[PDB]
């Protein structure tokens, strides 16, 4: 019933999967042996009473997957469904898409098919990765293409950690991002922007932590994923499936790159002093300082906002928040979308992991919003790429792995088309 | 003073390995996801470990 298959590609995808899966196990009560039916979506029920995640971990490097295997969650994960190779892409899209990713994609697809045969109401796929690396970009692209050609029109969310405007781990990160943008456009119905600087600033200003890290950002991304997916698992006033916000969020096939904002994302120090009303939390959500994407909404107009509410939120409070946001002039909407809002309500309050910085809140709000402002990140990315490719930097590595030279030019043309489309859709009639 | 001997061998800075902070060699994953995990709970173990003492849990 109403299943959802998770595919975790690359190191970033595997870490995000670790965080989101401890969150899912804690939320549905999954515990190690010897220690509601809403868990059917993310877990498969053995007749023995055991519960197995519906997630394929897929990495070309033995490190992260073998480390999960050596960890405690080895009991949780099937010995298979946890596929690890021997050689990584090494920040090479060509290496991860043409040479190393080709020998493992068949096994990944076979395992995905066996996972899908256990589901009769599969809502869709959820691919977690970062296009900064090679296997996250190249192998992720290949797997998305194969899943698109195999599973037809099944919903396919992709939680992608795009490179941040200033902070970047690798020097070839713009290359990988621009190369993977083609697949992330063609074969990803909704792509969620999850860059690092915005999350860092958010958890610095709100959680009051001076040392945020990968674990913290992955716990936050897991909270966002659970908030998005809780509507089908738990009963609520206005439940939404995957396709329900699919339709309400994608106005054109080319325009689906969306940003997220989660609140009340606060620490326990301020949780029991602040009064987090529904209107207040909605205002904090729409504030530019409470968003997960480093992109000011004031640089564009919202095309379609989709709100997810968890907890004891009342639809009257929801409507009051919608009305006050519409009245406020600091939030601007595109002219041809007067409604512009699609909100759902769920009765399940957020589940807090032990030892996490997040504090328990009686209610929570999650964003999935298509806004014309998002063109800033693509502008930064191709402003990096054009000067990078001005005189053939880091191109021999990509060529030597079996890629033609014109792929970078084709990807630049695609990115220019995306930016032109984003500028055009916001144009007044 | 075994740590002292090791530090003397090393030219540059060297803290006592016997100190608990350095002795704990858990990763970020291990520290943040299984904070109270023991050595016996990991996949690979010394052959001297008795199977009766070990946790007979193989699923979640």
């Amino acid at each position: 019933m109403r299943e959802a298959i998770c595919i975790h590609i690359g190191q970033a995808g595997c870490q995000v999967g670790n965080a989101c899966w401890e969150l899912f196990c804690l939320e549905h009560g999954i515990q190690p042996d010897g220690s509601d039916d809403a868990f059917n979506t993310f877990f498969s029920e053995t007749g023995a009473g055991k519960h197995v995640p519906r997630c394929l971990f897929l990495d070309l490097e033995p490190t992260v997957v073998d480390e999960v295997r050596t960890g405690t969650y080895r009991q949780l994960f099937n010995p298979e469904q946890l596929v690890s190779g021997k050689e990584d892409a090494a920040n090479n899209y060509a290496r991860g898409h043409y040479t190393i990713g080709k020998e493992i994609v068949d096994l990944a697809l076979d395992r995905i098919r066996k996972l899908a045969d256990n589901c009769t109401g599969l809502q869709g796929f959820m691919v977690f990765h970062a296009v900064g690396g090679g296997t996250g970009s190249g192998l992720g692209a290949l797997l998305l293409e194969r899943l698109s050609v195999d599973y037809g029109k099944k919903s396919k969310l992709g939680y992608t950690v795009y490179p941040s405007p200033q902070v970047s781990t690798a020097v070839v990160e713009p290359y990988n991002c621009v190369l993977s943008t083609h697949s992330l456009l063609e074969h990803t119905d909704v792509a969620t922007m999850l860059d690092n600087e915005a999350i860092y600033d958010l958890t610095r200003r709100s959680l009051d932590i001076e040392r945020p890290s990968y674990t913290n950002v992955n716990r936050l991304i897991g909270q966002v994923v659970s908030s998005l997916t809780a509507s089908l698992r738990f009963d609520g006033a206005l439940n939404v499936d995957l396709t329900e916000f699919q339709t309400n969020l994608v106005p054109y096939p080319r325009i689906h790159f969306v940003l997220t904002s989660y609140a009340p994302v606060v620490s326990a120090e301020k949780a029991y002093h602040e009064q987090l009303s529904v209107a207040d939390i909605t205002n904090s959500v729409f504030e530019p300082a409470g968003m997960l994407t480093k992109c000011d909404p004031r640089h564009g107009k919202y095309m379609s906002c989709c709100l997810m509410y968890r907890g004891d939120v009342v639809p009257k409070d929801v409507n009051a928040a919608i009305a006050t946001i519409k009245t406020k002039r600091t939030i601007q909407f595109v002219d041809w979308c007067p409604t512009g809002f699609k909100c759902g309500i769920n009765y399940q309050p957020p589940t807090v992991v032990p030892g996490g910085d997040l504090a328990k809140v009686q209610r929570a709000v999650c964003m999935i919003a298509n806004s014309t402002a998002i063109a800033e990140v693509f502008a930064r990315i191709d402003h990096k790429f054009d000067l990078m490719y001005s005189k053939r930097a880091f191109v021999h590595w990509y060529v030597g792995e079996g890629m033609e030279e014109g792929e970078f030019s084709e990807a630049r043309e695609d990115l220019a088309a995306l930016e032109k489309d984003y500028e055009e859709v916001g144009a007044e009639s | 003073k075994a740590d002292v001997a090791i530090s003397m061998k090393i030219p540059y800075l060297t803290m006592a390995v016997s100190s608990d902070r350095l002795k704990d060699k858990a990763t970020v994953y291990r520290k943040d996801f299984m904070k109270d995990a023991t050595q016996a709970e990991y996949r690979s173990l010394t052959y001297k470990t008795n199977l009766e003492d070990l946790n007979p849990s193989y699923a979640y």
């Binding site: 042996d33 010897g34 | 946790n55 849990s57």
Partner: peptide, 10 residues
Amino acid sequence: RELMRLSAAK
């Protein structure tokens, strides 16, 4: 059952 008892003890 003994495993459950030890886990409860923990």
